[PDB]
Amino acid sequence: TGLAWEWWRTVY
Amino acid sequence: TPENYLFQGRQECYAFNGTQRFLERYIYNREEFARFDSDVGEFRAVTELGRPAAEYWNSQKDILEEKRAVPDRMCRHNYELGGPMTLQRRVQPRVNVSPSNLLVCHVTDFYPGSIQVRWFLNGQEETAGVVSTNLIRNGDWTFQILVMLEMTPQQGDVYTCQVEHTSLDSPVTVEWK
Amino acid sequence: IKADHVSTYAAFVQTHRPTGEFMFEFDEDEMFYVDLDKKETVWHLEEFGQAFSFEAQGGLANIAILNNNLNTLIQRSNHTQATNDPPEVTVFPKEPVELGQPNTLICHIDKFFPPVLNVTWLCNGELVTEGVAESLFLPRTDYSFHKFHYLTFVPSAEDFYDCRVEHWGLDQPLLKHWEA
Ligand SMILES: *[C@@H]1O[C@H](CO)[C@@H](O)[C@H](O)[C@H]1NC(C)=O
Ligand SMILES: *[C@@H]1O[C@H](CO)[C@@H](O)[C@H](O)[C@H]1NC(C)=O
Numbered sequence: 202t203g204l205a206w207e208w209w210r211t212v213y
Numbered sequence: 214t215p216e217n218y219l220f221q222g223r224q225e226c227y228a229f230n231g232t233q234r235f236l237e238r239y240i241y242n243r244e245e246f247a248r249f250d251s252d253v254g255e256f257r258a259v260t261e262l263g264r265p266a267a268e269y270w271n272s273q274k275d276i277l278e279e280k281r282a283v284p285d286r287m288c289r290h291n292y293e294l295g296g297p298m299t300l301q302r303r304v305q306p307r308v309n310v311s312p313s314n315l316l317v318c319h320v321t322d323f324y325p326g327s328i329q330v331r332w333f334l335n336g337q338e339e340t341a342g343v344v345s346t347n348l349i350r351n352g353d354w355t356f357q358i359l360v361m362l363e364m365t366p367q368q369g370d371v372y373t374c375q376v377e378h379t380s381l382d383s384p385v386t387v388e389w390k
Numbered sequence: 391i392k393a394d395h396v397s398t399y400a401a402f403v404q405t406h407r408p409t410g411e412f413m414f415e416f417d418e419d420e421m422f423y424v425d426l427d428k429k430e431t432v433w434h435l436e437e438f439g440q441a442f443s444f445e446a447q448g449g450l451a452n453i454a455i456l457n458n459n460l461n462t463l464i465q466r467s468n469h470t471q472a473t474n475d476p477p478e479v480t481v482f483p484k485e486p487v488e489l490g491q492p493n494t495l496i497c498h499i500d501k502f503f504p505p506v507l508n509v510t511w512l513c514n515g516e517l518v519t520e521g522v523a524e525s526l527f528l529p530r531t532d533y534s535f536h537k538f539h540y541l542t543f544v545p546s547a548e549d550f551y552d553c554r555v556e557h558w559g560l561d562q563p564l565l566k567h568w569e570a
Binding site for chain 2: 205207
Binding site: 222 | 391392393394395396397398399400401402403404405406416417418419420421434435437438441442452456459460463464466467469470471472474482484485486496503504505506525529532533534538540558
């Protein structure tokens with residue numbers, strides 16, 4: 202199947 | 214020295230007793246300035262450089278809600294999926310004995326890092342004069358260890374090196390002389 | 391933190407050497423990464439690719455996000471560049487050394503920053519270009535980096551090897567000697 206990931210957020 | 218600036222981040226999942234803990238780090242040149250901790254619930258500045266970044270992130274509720282779902286959306290998903298290939302990966306070790314007056318028990322190619330190596334002389338476990346190296350990562354998802362034994366060679370003596378590993382049901386032994 | 395196992399996504403962007411890298415490690419072992427410039431998921435072991443899959447664009451996206459975070463942090467940090475940390479180099483074989491038995495010479499570079507490195511193998515004082523392999527700029531918990539370099543060889547009593555490492559934190563290249 203597939204592995205998950207996550208978005209790093211944007212800085213000010 | 215040339216002009217160079219670096220920005221790095223970490224997305225760490227900590228599994229223990231069936232739980233998952235997510236930490237997201239925001240680093241600029243080895244200086245961690247912003248961090249989200251699942252046990253905390255929101256972003257918090259680790260240094261003065263990251264206060265404006267953490268304050269802006271805590272206002273955006275979707276950002277705070279998305280990160281709180283990571284320990285279950287990503288950490289739990291990958292930990293259960295990578296079970297057979299990573300968690301229950303077992304590679305049997307290879308044992309070699311050479312005299313190089315010391316005796317070297319060279320244990321190579323095994324993945325589960327936890328291992329114990331004991332030296333025996335004529336059935337007697339030797340403790341004095343035993344020098345073992347640290348765990349040696351090969352990068353091939355394999356490990357090494359070398360256990361030296363200072364010996365006073367006697368004719369008829371039998372030096373045996375036993376290895377007990379999670380990848381083995383019975384300990385492996387190799388003898389010298 | 392109490393943990394039986396630790397799975398971590400690691401990624402960085404910088405100005406020199408590799409401008410980006412996106413990898414995933416399990417218990418400090420790199421499992422897969424996203425090959426920027428080729429934009430496909432490269433698995434460390436072939437058996438990993440047969441049991442899992444990864445959207446390689448998740449790395450390319452995260453790299454683009456870290457790119458603007460770098461520019462934003464470059465401005466707020468008053469254009470501050472970190473101190474060059476010299477590396478520790480160790481050379482050791484993968485298997486017990488036996489004459490005529492093919493082996494792999496492992497050169498481990500550790501505890502350096504920034505991830506800008508020139509590593510080259512030398513056998514009997516001349517460059518070795520074939521049979522060589524290298525690992526990624528692996529991350530450490532203290533935010534420095536370490537790296538692996540491999541060389542396949544046949545152990546001979548005449549050959550003596552060197553792992554030459556060049557870094558900004560060093561005054562001169564570091565020669566790490568090894569022989570059987
Ligand atoms: C682990 O989980 C079990 C079941 O919830 C609990 O009984 C035990 O106390 C936990 N141990 C630790 C160290 O958290
Ligand atoms: C690697 O070698 C190139 C070739 O001259 C050089 O420009 C670069 O600065 C070197 N990198 C390091 C870290 O020494």
